[PDB]
Amino acid sequence: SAFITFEGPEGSGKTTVINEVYHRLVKDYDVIMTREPGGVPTGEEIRKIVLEGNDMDIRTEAMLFAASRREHLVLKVIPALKEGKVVLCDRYIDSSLAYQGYARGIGVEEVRALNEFAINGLYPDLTIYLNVSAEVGRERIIKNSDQEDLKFHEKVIEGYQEIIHNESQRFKSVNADQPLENVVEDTYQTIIKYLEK
């Protein structure tokens, strides 16, 4: 079994990359792709609270992402891993670290402690980081489309770089500035290398 997560800011081509990689991997592996809340009832109810939030306190928001994360992990991820599957998960702990911890300013360490309570030692075996420059990301969120939104996007990227610097061994950075066909190929090759070894 293997638990692989995908991370990156908006404009990194993430959703498109995970979908294409998943379509290629199913040919050779027993794999599922999911994301939180991923249809788990309590997680879906938590998502409604988050989306209905009127200027929600950032720590309450971080706890709701963590509670949805645990429900999705216990009811969906863990049973698939026990069946020997490869699980591809679109966003996991590192999204809370980059967004809630770094960009929103709670602190990466504090958000990590909250998430360790939620995941109870179940870190990913491998995390693909779709490394898009702030400039390319900005353009992918202009062509397919504010100073405070641009500043937030830059802060999310800065947060992912701090996370990757501190836990390099768990991450594989993929150049997401390339055309999407190349990003897909590099991501697929990185995953097969890990799965075959």
Measured from the CB atom, the residue of 142 and 193 that comes closer to ligand T05 is: 142
Among 32, 33, 67, 81, binds its own copies (CB under 8 A): 67
By the rule CB under 6 A, 51 interacts with ligand T05:
yes
Binding region for its own copies (CB under 8 A) out of 1-9, 59-67, 158-166, 171-179: 59-67
Per-residue binding string, its own copies, 27-46, x by CB under 8 A, is --------------xx--xx
CA atoms within 13 A on the CB side of 17: 35
Strand order of the sheet with strand 171-175? 31-35, 86-90, 2-7, 126-131, 171-175
Of 127-186, binders to ligand T05 (CB under 6 A) are none
By the rule CB under 8 A, 146 interacts with its own copies:
no
Give the footprint of its own copies on this chain (CB under 8 A): 41-42, 45-46, 48-49, 52-54, 56-57, 59-60, 62-64, 66-67, 70-71, 74, 110, 113-114, 117-118, 120
